[PDB]
Structures are given as structure tokens and as C-alpha cells.
Write a protein that binds this ligand. Structure first.
Ligand SMILES: [Zn+2]
Ligand SMILES: [Zn+2]
Ligand SMILES: [Zn+2]
Lengths: 155, 270, 213, 224, 84, 92
């Protein structure tokens, strides 16, 4: 691979390096072989990264992966959008599946979900569009994230 | 025009109706299956058939009048249809004699289960560990030694395996084996004996959802706006013939048939 | 052999532990950490080469900025046994040593195993916690990796101030698992918060937080 | 599936992004508090080239007759040769640049220099050069203090968070760290005088426009 | 759960959502024969009128901003800066 | 077809057009006006001037909310099945 690295005089310069690419993963055991640089070892299995390096590494790797999928077909998406996804999937300390599967509130509306709501003593914060529709109110998103009221000190 | 401050709803707290609160809010004790008159009980003062008037109850409507709740006092307790699976699972965790949770902080993997944050995830895990427990153990290994035992509160008694036989729950004991339906009244008492801690562990809420309320003792009766039928009429007729059977101290099987007739109606209601 | 690929694995692990112990706030000198394969080869030598572990073991004392901020804490005993699998007997001599020194932490570094039967002597002498490590997962210092940002343990004071000014309940912070390799490395206890300082392509520097579950 | 997982995330009036339970997801949105629609690829100069190139570009050494500011770039250009007190100010600025270059070299390890950032300084400057019909063949009436103090003060005003405590104040310092690198590299004294040739008037307008475009770029509470 | 006029840490800028909802709320009232507060120098469209009022800082409404934890800051439309 | 389904709902959320969202997704079901207890939070209010819960035993902590009639029905349906849908004008 080519590697952009600063030179003794300061400019980036291409320093090519030999790299090993493998089929199959054992991060914990490879990481440890002499002659490698274990600070740079990588894998596309963000699960293994989170298990050896921890979620914060798990997070960054998960970003690099979602990023590559998008970049793979030439397209570019601002950082914060994938940053946000990656934080949601990571915020409870492990890797939460997204697509999987997976209020109130209200399509089926499996009475069975309300039964568990009842037995669980579940508290609906009512921020969704849907529970606000059932209640005939404006949802506290965007244009309704605040109240309006009459001023009573303007001349 | 209404005196009351106008507001939007910000929160909805789900919960189970206690029997005390259902009694607390009713506008009429209800118990004779008839709608001259009027208007036993039922339908008072519940009320306002159509129009005029004007309750009671209250004073509008119809169309302004919300509708109000009555209650029926159930001669025996009955399962709530929706909660049998839960009721069964809880029984599979609680010791069926003394009410104590079958595993606790002393157990290796029960500590891991108890830590779980989401109360459905936690209940899952606690049930997974306890459906195995076949004894309410008086004493346990701890660390340490074993040799050294450590004591808990309950109790000694053996646990049943529980099967769902339609609307009844069936027990199976030993260590050939002893079968016995587990009656509603019995589970109602077990549940009542489960601690605030133990039932919170288990995803219940001491204010909004105690497990005993999964067992109905007191039906809320919906007002005319809710039924613009007569299933309640049949629930009543079963309830009647069950009271008029204890009053006659008639044999165990007779009380039980009329008990599961009532179960059948509160269930299919519902 | 190449039990010299083994002196290496042991020496690297000793290094990690010294770094771990250092980043936890204890007084190790950078000169200490940087102990050459050869000086190690000598200071813990037996000839014919070999280990040997028991000699490696060492006490460890908080620093002055440590007890500036976490005044409480205490001192620490790191131990290297010495026999591949650790039964119940050889754990108690450790468990008792810690005890009879009021050591607030013991780290036990083991080679292959402890029995699932000796692991129960662990949560056994409160408040003093006892932690274990496979030398294997000590041979490399994970926190030195490119993708591992700097986790700083917050004092319960800094914690209070954090929750107060974002006006948060504990349950609203992002979480870190008690057994996250980085929590294990800093020795996080349930309820403690880390400040994570990461470099960021949008703002250069961004600090987030995780509370230990 | 993606929509369902994220659907309830919203920016709140304290600049945090939270879900419907109110759990924190990012302490500030995008790690910089900005709206992606006001953000554009801009070059972090500070980061490329040799050291020789960097020194030649940024260094002002009033105490050296060769690396000082040419009297022609500046009205006070000859009153300023030898000015110790002013060299102290110019050494703060250079060190801050050196630090920044080092820092940026950590964040973008491969030396990539173009990164989406708010406020296009280059354009604000070409505007100023046009609006004020900037005579490239005359001394500026900008003093050294105007620039160095001017630019320091402007950073104090790029607000993303407003709370008056040690924690929010740090979060704020972090939020504009990368932008301020860009800013200090564009508004290095020498660069202003020799390359841009701004006048006291044009410069003052560049500053306040950066401030206005900046505040205009902050994400708005209520954004889904 | 109410935070004094002198300790407001939220933005002194009106958001694009605030402006939309304010303009829409006044529009509705103008659209229903509610008294008006400026010289309509030709204007007959409630939203255009509503915009004239905003411009000239004569909309007597207050925005109550809720913090995630339930507390809230009050800013008058008159007060808030309108640059978007 | 002509439709406003899940994906159009999402665009309007992305725009934060909440009034439009309310108006499109609602109904002629018009505001039924009910009274709710401030302590429990059920439609148990006997509302001459004119109102008490029992209770609760409440006479001076009462509100008034407009909700779609279907809502009022679905909440009573819920109550009739021993579930309490408690409505609060608050946050815990
Ligand atoms: Zn009525
Ligand atoms: Zn027992
Ligand atoms: Zn009440």
C-alpha cells in the first residue's frame, strides 16, 4: 500500500509498506504476534474490535465500515449522518442491531402490547407523531418543540 | 363552557386497575342482570340512555356526558384472560407456598439477571433461571466454602411444574407426582405475599402494577357510550348462580363448575 | 525452543500491567515501564532462563494528584503466579495476603486458568476488589491502539458536576459495560463515569461520556 | 429500518441530540453543533507543505530585518522594526500556529487538508477585496494589534453553547477547535497583509461577517 | 421548573421553526379579522402581513422553550433576533 | 396511488412540519372535551360549577383536555379491561 507520511523536512511523501490481508479473523491472537504493529491492526469485523478493543473502538470501526459501504459506490454523505447512526447503535455499551426488530400507538394494535404496558407500568413520554395523532395534538418535534403564548408586557 | 384549565397530554402512565380503585371510582355497585323504568342497576346513573336527560350523575349530556364506571363484585377471583401466561411465569419464579423469589443475590447468574435495566429483558432472564428451581431453598453455597452454607428465609417446600390447561393452571409436585389444579384464590394469596423488592425485580410497579391485580376480583363495568352487550349480563348470571351455591354450601365440584363458568365469561369478554 | 518466545510474552505483559497500573494513577516511573528485555531477563532470572513469576509480583502506591482527586482509593498488589491452572488453595493465599494488608485492590495475573471453583473466592472480601487477567490479554496494551481514544475516570465530584450541568439522570448517559476491555483496563466500578476525549473530523476535539453499567 | 431506529432523535435547546426517553446520544450535534447544510469543503493550510514553506508563510519577526514585514505592506511598517512588545504578540500567534499544525497532523494522520467546515473564509475575503476595491499596490492601515487582537476576540464570539460554567465553556472550546484552526490560518498577520492586503475597514468587515455566517450555521433546536 | 430571565443559556436567535410557527399563528389570527398592528402599505395577504409585523417587531407572543429535563426558558418574539 | 403513508410522514418529520403532520393525519372526529384528575389521571371526573373526582378525593386539581372521540372510547375500552391509561399534563 501507499502510505502518506511526513518527511524529515515536513511535506507528506509516499512511503510504501507491505501489508498482510487475511481471510478469517482472530484479532486477540494475531494482535500479539511479534513483528507486527499492534496499534494499527485492523479488521472489518467491528464485533471483534468491540470485544478486544472496547465499544469506543467498536464505534470508530463501525463508522469506517458504514462509511466504506457508502464510499464504495462513489457517493458521499456528510459525517454527522453516519456518526449519528453509529452512536445510536453503540450508546447502550454494546452493538445494538438497527434493522432488527423491534408507545402505544398504534397500527396493529396488538392489545397484547397494551397488556404488557399495563403490567410493566410503562410511561409514554408522548413525543412521537402517532401518539400525538391519537390524542389530536401537535407533536413536540420541529415546529412544535415549544409552546407559544400571549405576551403581557409589550406596549 | 368549562371552569377547568385547558391542557395537552404530555405523559401517559400505563398501569393495572387495583380492585380498591375500581371500587373507589364507580358511580354504582352493579349486580342484577337487567335493563320499567330504567335501570336496575343497570344502567343507573351510569348513565343517560338517550336523551333527555341528563344523568344524575354528573349532569349533561348525552354528547357532553363522558359516561361513567360501575363495578361488579366477583363472588370469586378470576384470571384476567390477557395475563394467564404472565401469571404462570410469575408462579414459575415465586415459591408457590411462601411467596419468596426462588433464586436471589446469592446465586452466581441471578446477580447478572437482576442487574438488567429493561424490565422485560430482566423478567425474561429471571424466569429462565427459576423455572428450573424445584425447591424454595432454606440454605445455599454463597462463596466460599461450601463447606459454609448461608441461609435465606423460606421455607423448604417443593415447587410444581405448571401447565396451561385452557383457562385453569395445573400443578405437578414431588422429589410420584401429585396433580392438582392451582385455584385462582391460591395464586391471589401467593401474589399478595410477594415483596415490593421481589415483584419490582420481576418488572412490576408497586404503585401502578402489583402482580395481584392481574387477578380480577372486581370488574369495571363500561357505560352506555362504550356499548351503544349483554356479555356482562351473562357474566352476572354466572356470578349470581355462584353466590347462590356458596349460600347453599353445595359440593366442591358444583362450586368449581360455576367458578369456571364465571372464569369463562370474564375471559371471553375480554 | 523458544521458551524465549515466552520470556517475551511475559515481559510484554509485565510492561502492559505497569502501564495499566500507571494510567490508573499509581506511582510507576516511565523508566520502570520501559524495562529492557535484558534487564527483565536478569532481575527475574532463574537459569536455565525460565520464569519465574512469584518474584515479579509487586505493591503499588497512588500518586499525589491521584489522592488530590480520588482521596480514598488505596494501594494495590499485583500478583503473578506461577502455575498454569489456579485451583482453590493457591487463590486463598492471595485472597488472604490482600486482606491482611488492607490492600484496596488485588490484580491477579494468571497464565492459563483459574477453576470456575476458585473464581468464587473473588467477590469475597468487600470493599477491596479483586480483578483477574489472562497474561494473553495483557501481552498487548489495547489502549495504545489507533482506534482507542483516551478514557479518563471521573471523580464522583466531576460526575456530580457533569450530571448537574447537562441536567441528566444517570440513566441518560451513554453506557460502558463493566467488562468492556477498557473498563477492565481502568478497573471501572459500576456507577463510575469515564470522560472519553476523541479527535473528531468535524470539530477537532469532542468529549463524550460513558457510565459503567 | 434506518428511519425507525433514528426517527425520534432531535436537537434540543441545549444543543444535545436525544431520543424520546431523553437519553443523550451526542453531547453536541455532529460533534460541532452545526447544520450540515451550512458546511463546505475548505482547506486547512496549516497542515500541508514543508516546514520551510510554513515558516515563510506565517512567521513575522519584527526583530529581524529579513523576516519582518516589508514597510510597503503596512503604514506602520517602519515604526515596527524592532518592536519588542509587538514581537511578544507575534510570537503568541506563531506558537499557536505551530501548535495547530502539530494538532491537525494528529487528527488527519495522512495529511488530508480539505474538510467540510462552516463559513467559507476564502469567499468572505474575495468579497471584501471587491466591495472595498482593494488597491493591491499600497500599504494597509491595519496595525499588528488590529489583526492579532481582532482575530483573538472574534474566536471569543463564535458561540455554539452559551452556559456560564466550566463544563459548557469547555464543550464550547472543543466545538470550535477545528474552525478556529482554519480561522487562525487564514488570518495570520502576514497572510492578511502580504497575500490579502486588507485595509482596517475591509478587515473589520471580514471579522463581523465571519461571526454572522457562523451563528447562522448553528443547528436549530427542533431539527429532526 | 422555570428559569429566570437572567440565566437563559438558550440561543438569542429565533429558530427557523419558531419563525414558521409564529408567522403561521399570527397569519391565522389576521386571517380571522383579528386586529392588526402595522401599516399595511397595500398588503392584503395574512402571511405577508404577519411578516410585516415580525419585521417591525410587533408580534406580542412569547416562546416557551422546553429543556429535555422539563424546565423552560421564556423569550418574547420582540426580544429574539431574526437572522436566518 | 395518492397516499400519505409512512414515508411521506417521515419527510414531513424531517422538515419538522408538525402542524401539517397534525392536520393531515387527524380527522373530523372533533375534540371531545373530557375532564381528568390531576392525581390519578383518568376520565373519572363528575363535571352548576360543578366538579370532583372521588377519589383521590380531589376537588382542586382538575384539568380539561380535548381529544379525538375515538381516543376517549379506546381509553374506556382499556379501562373496562382493567388497564389504567393515566393522562398527565406533566413530566414525572
Ligand atoms: Zn354523566
Ligand atoms: Zn417458600
Ligand atoms: Zn382522581
Amino acid at each position: 500500500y501507499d502510505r502518506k507520511v511526513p518527511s524529515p523536512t515536513g511535506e507528506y511523501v509516499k512511503e510504501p509498506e507491505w501489508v498482510l490481508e487475511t481471510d478469517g479473523v482472530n484479532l486477540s491472537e494475531v494482535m500479539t504476534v511479534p513483528g507486527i504493529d499492534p496499534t494499527r491492526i485492523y479488521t472489518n469485523s467491528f464485533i471483534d474490535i468491540m470485544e478486544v478493543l472496547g465499544i469506543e473502538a467498536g464505534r470508530a470501526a463501525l463508522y469506517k465500515e458504514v462509511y466504506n459501504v457508502i464510499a464504495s459506490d462513489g457517493s458521499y454523505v456528510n459525517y454527522r449522518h453516519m456518526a449519528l447512526l453509529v452512536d445510536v447503535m453503540t450508546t447502550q455499551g454494546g452493538l445494538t442491531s438497527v434493522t432488527r426488530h423491534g408507545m402505544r400507538c398504534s397500527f396493529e394494535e396488538t392489545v397484547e402490547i397494551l397488556f404488557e404496558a399495563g403490567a410493566s407500568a410503562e410511561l409514554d413520554d408522548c413525543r412521537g407523531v402517532s401518539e400525538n395523532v391519537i390524542l389530536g395534538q401537535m407533536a413536540p418535534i420541529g415546529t412544535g418543540a415549544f409552546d407559544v403564548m400571549i405576551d403581557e408586557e409589550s406596549l | 363552557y368549562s371552569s377547568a384549565p385547558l391542557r395537552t397530554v404530555k405523559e401517559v402512565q400505563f398501569g393495572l386497575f387495583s380492585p380498591e380503585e375500581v371500587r373507589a371510582i364507580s358511580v354504582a355497585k352493579i349486580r342484577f342482570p337487567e335493563t320499567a323504568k330504567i335501570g336496575g342497576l343497570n344502567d343507573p346513573r351510569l348513565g343517560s340512555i338517550d336523551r333527555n336527560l341528563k344523568c344524575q350523575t354528573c349532569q349533561e349530556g348525552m354528547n357532553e356526558c363522558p359516561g361513567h364506571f360501575g363495578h361488579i363484585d366477583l363472588a370469586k377471583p378470576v384470571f384476567h384472560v390477557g395475563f394467564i401466561a404472565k401469571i404462570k411465569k410469575v408462579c414459575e419464579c415465586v415459591c408457590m407456598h411462601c411467596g419468596k423469589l426462588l433464586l436471589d443475590e446469592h446465586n452466581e447468574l441471578m446477580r447478572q439477571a437482576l442487574a438488567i435495566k429493561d424490565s422485560k429483558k430482566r423478567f425474561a432472564a429471571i424466569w429462565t433461571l427459576c423455572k428450573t428451581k424445584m425447591v424454595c431453598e432454606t440454605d445455599v453455597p454463597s462463596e466460599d466454602d461450601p463447606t459454609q452454607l448461608v441461609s435465606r428465609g423460606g421455607c423448604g417446600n417443593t415447587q410444581p411444574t405448571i401447565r396451561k390447561d385452557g383457562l385453569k393452571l395445573v400443578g405437578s409436585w414431588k422429589k410420584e407426582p401429585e396433580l392438582r389444579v392451582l385455584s385462582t384464590e391460591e395464586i391471589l394469596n401467593i401474589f399478595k405475599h410477594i415483596s415490593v423488592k421481589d415483584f419490582t425485580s420481576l418488572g412490576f410497579n408497586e404503585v401502578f402494577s402489583r402482580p395481584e391485580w392481574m387477578i380480577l376480583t372486581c370488574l369495571p363495568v363500561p357505560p352506555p357510550p362504550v356499548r351503544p352487550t349483554f356479555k356482562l349480563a351473562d357474566i352476572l348470571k354466572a356470578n349470581i348462580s355462584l353466590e347462590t351455591l356458596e349460600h347453599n354450601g353445595a359440593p366442591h365440584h358444583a362450586i368449581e363448575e360455576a367458578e369456571s363458568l364465571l372464569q369463562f365469561h370474564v375471559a371471553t369478554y375480554m | 525452543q523458544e521458551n524465549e518466545r515466552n520470556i517475551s510474552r511475559l515481559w510484554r505483559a509485565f510492561r502492559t500491567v505497569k502501564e495499566m497500573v500507571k494510567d490508573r494513577g499509581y506511582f510507576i516511573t516511565q523508566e520502570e515501564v520501559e524495562l529492557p528485555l535484558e534487564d527483565f531477563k536478569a532481575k527475574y532470572c532463574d537459569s536455565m532462563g525460565r520464569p519465574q513469576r512469584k518474584m515479579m509480583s509487586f505493591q503499588a502506591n497512588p500518586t499525589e494528584e491521584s489522592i488530590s482527586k480520588f482521596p480514598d482509593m488505596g494501594s494495590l498488589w499485583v500478583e503473578f503466579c506461577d502455575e498454569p491452572s489456579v485451583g482453590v488453595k493457591t487463590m486463598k493465599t492471595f485472597v488472604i495476603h490482600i486482606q491482611e494488608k488492607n490492600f484496596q485492590t488485588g490484580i491477579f495475573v494468571y497464565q492459563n486458568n483459574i477453576t470456575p471453583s476458585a473464581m468464587k473466592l473473588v467477590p469475597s472480601i468487600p470493599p477491596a476488589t479483586i480483578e483477574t487477567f489472562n497474561e494473553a490479554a495483557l501481552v498487548v496494551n489495547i489502549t495504545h491502539h489507533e482506534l482507542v481514544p483516551k478514557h479518563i475516570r471521573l471523580s464522583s465530584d466531576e460526575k456530580r458536576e457533569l450530571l448537574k450541568r447537562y441536567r441528566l439522570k444517570e440513566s441518560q448517559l451513554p453506557r460502558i459495560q463493566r467488562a468492556d476491555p477498557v473498563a477492565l483496563y481502568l478497573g471501572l466500578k459500576r456507577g463510575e463515569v469515564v470522560k472519553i476525549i476523541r479527535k473528531s473530523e468535524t470539530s477537532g476535539r469532542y468529549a463524550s461520556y460513558r457510565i459503567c453499567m | 429500518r434506518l428511519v425507525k431506529a433514528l426517527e425520534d432523535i432531535m436537537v434540543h435547546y441545549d444543543n444535545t441530540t436525544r431520543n424520546s426517553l431523553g437519553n443523550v446520544i451526542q453531547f453536541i450535534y455532529g460533534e460541532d453543533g452545526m447544520d450540515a447544510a451550512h458546511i463546505e469543503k475548505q482547506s486547512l493550510d496549516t497542515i500541508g507543505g514543508s516546514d520551510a514553506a510554513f515558516e515563510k508563510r506565517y512567521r513575522v519577526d519584527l526583530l529581524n530585518t529579513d523576516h519582518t514585514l516589508d514597510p510597503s505592506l503596512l503604514e506602520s511598517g517602519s515604526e515596527i522594526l524592532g518592536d519588542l512588545k509587538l514581537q511578544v504578540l507575534l510570537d503568541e500567534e506563531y506558537k499557536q500556529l505551530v501548535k495547530d499544525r502539530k494538532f491537525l497532523r494528529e487528527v488527519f494522520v495522512d495529511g488530508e487538508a480539505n474538510w467540510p467546515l462552516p463559513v467559507n473564509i476564502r469567499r468572505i475575503i474575495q468579497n471584501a477585496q471587491q466591495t472595498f476595491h482593494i488597491d493591491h499596490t499600497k500599504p494597509s492601515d491595519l496595525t499588528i494589534k488590529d489583526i492579532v487582537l481582532g482575530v483573538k476576540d472574534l474566536q471569543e464570539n463564535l458561540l455554539v453553547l452559551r452556559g456560564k460554567n466550566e463544563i459548557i465553556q469547555n464543550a464550547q472550546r472543543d466545538a470550535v477547535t477545528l474552525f478556529c484552526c482554519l480561522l487562525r490560518s487564514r488570518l495570520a498577520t502576514r497572510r492578511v497583509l502580504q497575500e490579502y492586503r486588507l485595509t482596517k475597514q475591509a478587515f473589520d468587515w471580514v471579522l463581523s461577517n465571519i461571526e454572522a455566517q457562523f451563528l447562522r450555521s448553528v443547528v436549530h433546536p427542533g431539527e429532526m | 421548573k422555570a428559569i429566570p430571565k437572567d440565566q437563559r443559556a438558550t440561543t438569542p436567535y429565533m429558530t427557523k421553526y419558531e419563525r414558521a410557527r409564529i408567522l403561521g399563528t399570527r397569519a391565522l389570527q389576521i386571517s380571522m379579522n383579528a386586529p392588526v398592528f402595522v401599516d399595511l402599505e397595500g398588503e392584503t395577504d395574512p402571511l405577508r402581513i404577519a411578516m410585516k409585523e415580525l419585521a417591525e417587531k410587533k408580534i406580542p407572543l412569547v416562546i416557551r422553550r422546553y429543556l429535555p429535563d422539563g424546565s423552560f426558558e421564556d423569550w418574547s418574539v420582540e426580544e429574539l433576533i431574526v437572522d436566518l | 396511488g395518492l397516499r400519505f403513508g409512512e414515508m411521506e410522514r417521515d419527510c414531513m418529520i424531517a422538515h419538522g412540519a408538525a402542524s401539517f403532520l397534525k392536520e393531515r393525519l387527524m380527522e373530523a372526529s372533533d375534540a371531545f372535551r373530557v375532564h381528568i384528575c390531576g392525581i390519578c389521571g383518568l376520565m373519572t371526573v363528575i363535571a352548576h360549577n360543578q366538579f370532583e373526582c372521588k377519589g383521590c378525593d380531589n376537588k382542586i386539581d382538575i384539568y380539561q383536555i380535548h381529544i379525538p372521540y375515538a381516543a376517549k372510547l379506546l381509553f374506556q375500552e382499556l379501562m373496562a379491561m382493567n388497564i389504567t391509561p393515566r393522562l398527565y399534563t406533566d413530566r414525572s
